[PDB]
């Protein structure tokens, strides 16, 4: 049950895979909809905009 996927989460990641995703941090600004920002945004002061 720890390694098999579960239907409770929206993603098909298991409990071990969910822990692996949360244990990875980025020293740079992350790749999450970064061009949704940097356009018409007041706080255009970050690494991925620049």
């Amino acid at each position: 049950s720890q390694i098999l996927p579960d239907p409770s989460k929206p993603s098909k990641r298991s409990f071990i895979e969910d822990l692996l995703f949360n244990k990875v941090t980025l020293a740079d600004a992350g790749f999450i909809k970064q061009y949704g920002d940097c356009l018409g945004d007041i706080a255009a002061r970050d690494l991925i905009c620049a």
Partner: protein, 98 residues
């Protein structure tokens, strides 16, 4: 942006002009590259047909005409600024493909 009165030029990590203060109107106007984006052209090969599609990098399908030269380029390039075959992907806005 919150500007200290004893400052005139605001810069970034790359030492380019980020924010400046207009001496007449005291408002903060941001120096930015004027709505840039990445263009990659997807084709099935000229040996088969001449139909092509354009993929725009990471931009929405709403601000695509104010990013591209919608008011400057030729109508042959302007058929790809907007149209019926507009699809929004995570990689960006795709025009041309169904």
């Amino acid at each position: 942006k919150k500007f200290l009165p004893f400052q005139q030029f605001g810069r970034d990590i790359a030492d380019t002009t980020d924010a400046v203060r207009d001496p007449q109107t005291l408002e903060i106007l941001d120096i930015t590259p004027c709505s840039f984006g990445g263009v990659s052209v997807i084709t099935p090969g000229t040996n088969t047909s001449n139909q092509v599609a354009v993929l725009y990098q990471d931009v929405n399908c709403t601000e695509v005409p104010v990013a591209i030269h919608a008011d400057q380029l030729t109508p042959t390039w302007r058929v790809y600024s907007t149209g019926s075959n507009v699809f929004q992907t995570r990689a960006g806005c795709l025009i041309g493909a169904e």
